[PDB]
């Protein structure tokens, strides 16, 4: 209805938000680090990083952290404003319960925010930002690459038997647990690695056979330039077969090594074919999500308690809540739209969910309080 | 109040914007390159690049450049429209000053845009998009890696003394100026590099000791598969100790090399632990920021001059400005909200800052002109 008192007290809340944001902007960076610790922990250690799209995203993130810190630390102020707004005397034996109201609301919001952070943030960020199936396969592939590297070192030392043994073991382990161009590129890299290892190892005596193997690899590269991947594969197979002649007594062993290389290449291609959705997390989106969660859970823990405390003395009877449930749902949905920075219905519903839950818990608490009062009377 | 003349002249401005955007769309790419030169120059030479998130971001960027070029080159048109809008005769000895008004406003906007570009853009893009502390450390790490590579080449040539000398010097230089898994992976890579260098160098005589070293490395990889990083570190240390036996007279030297490798690995891990915020700049955000800055500074240089020129003849007395200061601040804030594409209060304030500054400079200039006129009279 009227604006005067509402506008004045909204101005009080706004100036409180401004001053507390000014003070909290000093420690914006430590607060941002604390907020980002859960999401970073949920990320893999090898890719524990966040990207920033814009050049002012540091400034935007710091300003958002300051604004949200101000609005969080002004909750006692808005609680006092709300308590003063409704004060018809309230049977002044019951109007003295101001400090209990403000204190209970403040600790309710603080506990909601703390529980949000500690419980929800690590668990949910583990739920979303973790695959646990492609990561295990990637780790298995990295381990297999390490065993292949060890086999190549054994080859470089002139130990064909140990290299073949390791190659067979790795192939068995991989079997127990893709575009043509990509697979051909991987196979070419594997052939180059095997040729380099053989050149380092048996390059003092069998200099005439590695020359033929390298010529066959050159033929493979030529058949890879003009896309004739069948000829490229045939040339790589011939190169490996000739490479097997550097150690005639361990030919099978060398063959096994080549097989492993091919397998690894194939496997890697399969992995890069399977993972068409890589993570690249952003500063502002993650900050917005974390702040939205904390604010939503603070609302969830505060609105029921504030409503119940009003109902103990009586400012909102159950009749008014039942009459205005639909309008309250709508106004909560508009508030969720305002808070959410992204203009999508999905985020609107995700934000409005906590608001509706808080309202429902509040009305349940009010009804329970009224029933207990009636039973006592 | 009425719409007729306002709507007609707004239509004139809109059609002018449309035609100048149509002509300026021809040279959208060179203008975009000129606009992106400062931000690219502020970026490191090794990562002097911009990413585009969407497939139509080229088209969106070109269209935005064309629209903003049209609105920039239509400033004389809107100046003529404004001058014509207020013309009650203006004591027609003073109404003839139309061309001075339009010309002065046009050159004011052009000078504001040029100063914005040349002064602000390089300096501020250097301020934000430059770390200068992690980049120096990264360059030091790259140089240390280069010295380690030179030491490894000296080892590959059979020169253990020179390799040890370089390793000691690099370790001293690094000392003068992290997850367990990542550090173990880096140490494994360093051990592999050292083993490869030793195999290339002393692989003609000490073929029996590098075999034991490679077996110990295999044990390290096994203890790395099942996460037992303590055993992995012990196995790597044993592998390096055995590698030291290839040259018994230079054992310490080889030890030093291994130490350097470990140190480098550790250092690299520390760096990747410290840098949790990598840059990945986008086309549209950077273009929006640059265009916003240029438009804001054009407003800063134009609005005071336009207001002062109106005050010389008199269309806006100081009384009207003092009365409508609050409404003017609000309308400038809504204009800043309209211009800014991102729906955040931070960008709204960042845009509205220049508008308020322009209004304040305009009112100061109007007051100074009035005071000078009163003193003359």
């Amino acid at each position: 209805d009227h604006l005067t008192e509402l506008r004045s007290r909204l101005m009080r809340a706004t100036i409180a938000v401004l001053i507390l944001g000014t003070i909290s902007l000093v420690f914006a960076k430590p607060i941002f680090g604390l907020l980002m610790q859960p999401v970073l922990d949920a990320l893999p250690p090898e890719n524990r990083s966040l990207i920033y799209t814009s050049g002012i995203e540091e400034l935007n993130v710091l300003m958002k952290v300051g604004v949200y810190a101000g609005i969080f630390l002004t909750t006692p102020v808005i609680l006092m404003q709300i308590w003063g707004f409704v004060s018809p005397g309230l049977y002044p034996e019951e109007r003295r319960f101001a400090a209990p109201f403000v204190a209970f609301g403040s600790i309710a919001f603080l506990l909601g925010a703390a529980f949000a952070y500690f419980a929800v943030l690590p668990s949910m960020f583990t739920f979303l930002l973790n695959e646990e199936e492609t990561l295990a396969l990637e780790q298995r592939l990295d381990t297999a690459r390490l065993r292949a590297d060890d086999a190549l070192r054994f080859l470089r030392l002139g130990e064909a038997e140990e290299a073949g043994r390791i190659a067979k073991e790795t192939s068995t382990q991989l079997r127990a647990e893709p575009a043509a161009s990509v697979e051909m590129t991987g196979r070419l890299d594997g052939l180059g690695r095997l040729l380099d290892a053989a050149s380092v190892g048996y390059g003092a005596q069998s200099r005439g056979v590695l020359r033929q193997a390298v010529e066959k690899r050159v033929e493979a590269v030529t058949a890879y330039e003009k896309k004739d991947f069948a000829a490229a594969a045939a040339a790589m197979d011939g190169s490996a077969s000739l490479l097997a002649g550097i150690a005639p007594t361990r030919t099978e062993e060398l063959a096994g090594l080549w097989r492993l290389e091919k397998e690894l290449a194939t496997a890697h291609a399969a992995h890069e074919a399977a993972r068409w959705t890589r993570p690249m997390l952003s500063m502002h989106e993650q900050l917005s999500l974390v702040l939205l969660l904390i604010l939503a859970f603070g609302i969830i823990f505060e609105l029921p308690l504030v409503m119940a405390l009003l109902g103990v003395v009586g400012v909102v009877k159950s009749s008014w809540l039942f009459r205005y449930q639909r309008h309250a749902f709508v106004v909560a949905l508009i508030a969720a739209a305002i808070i959410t920075p992204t203009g999508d219905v999905v985020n609107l519903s995700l934000m409005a969910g906590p608001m509706l839950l808080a309202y429902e818990l509040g009305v349940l608490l009010v009804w329970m309080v009224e029933r207990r009062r009636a039973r006592n009377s | 109040d009425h719409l007729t003349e306002l709507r007609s002249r707004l239509m004139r401005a809109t059609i002018a914007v449309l035609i100048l955007g149509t002509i300026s769309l021809v040279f959208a790419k060179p203008i975009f390159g000129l606009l992106m030169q400062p931000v690219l120059d502020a970026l490191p030479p090794e990562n002097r690049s911009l990413i585009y998130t969407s497939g139509i971001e080229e088209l969106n960027v070109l269209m935005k450049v064309g629209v903003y070029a049209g609105i920039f080159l239509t400033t004389p048109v809107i100046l003529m429209q404004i001058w014509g809008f207020v013309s009650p005769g203006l004591y027609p000895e003073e109404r003839r000053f139309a061309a001075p008004f339009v010309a002065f406003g046009s050159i004011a906007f052009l000078l504001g845009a040029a100063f914005a570009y040349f002064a602000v853009l390089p300096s501020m893009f250097t301020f934000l998009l430059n770390e200068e502390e992690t980049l120096a450390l990264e360059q030091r790490l790259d140089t240390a890696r280069l010295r380690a590579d030179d030491a490894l080449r000296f080892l590959r040539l059979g020169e253990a003394e020179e390799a040890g000398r370089i390793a000691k010097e690099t370790s001293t230089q690094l000392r003068a100026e992290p997850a367990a898994s990542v550090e173990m992976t880096g140490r494994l890579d360093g051990l592999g590099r050292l083993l490869d260098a030793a195999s290339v160098g002393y692989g003609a005589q000490s073929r029996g000791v590098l075999r034991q070293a490679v077996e110990k490395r295999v044990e390290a990889v096994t203890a790395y598969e099942k996460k037992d990083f303590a055993a992995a570190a012990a196995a790597m240390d044993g592998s390096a100790s055995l590698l030291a036996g290839i040259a018994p007279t230079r054992t310490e030297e080889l030890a030093g090399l291994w130490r350097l490798e470990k140190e480098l690995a550790t250092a690299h891990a520390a760096h990747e632990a410290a840098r949790w915020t990598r840059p990945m700049l986008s086309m549209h955000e950077q273009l929006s920021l640059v265009l916003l800055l240029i438009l804001a500074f054009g407003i800063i240089f134009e609005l005071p001059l336009v207001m002062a020129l109106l005050g010389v003849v008199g269309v806006v007395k100081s009384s009207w400005l003092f009365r409508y200061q609050r409404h003017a601040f609000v309308v400038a804030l809504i204009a800043a909200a309209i211009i800014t594409p991102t729906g955040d209060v931070v960008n709204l304030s960042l845009m509205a800052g220049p508008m308020l500054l322009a209004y304040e400079l305009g009112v100061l200039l109007v007051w100074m002109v009035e005071r000078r006129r009163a003193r003359n009279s």
């Binding site: 604006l3 005067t4 008192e5 506008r7 004045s8 909204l10 101005m11 706004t14 508009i334 739209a337 305002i338 959410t340 920075p341 203009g343 | 609050r326 409404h327 601040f329 609000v330 804030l333 809504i334 909200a337 800014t340 729906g343 955040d344 209060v345 709204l348």
Partner: peptide
């Protein structure tokens, strides 16, 4: 957006005061 709208509304109600 909604944030810009609520900001302009807050400013409009703020300049006039109670």
């Amino acid at each position: 957006g909604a944030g810009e709208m609520v900001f302009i509304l807050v400013a409009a109600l703020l300049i006039l005061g109670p």
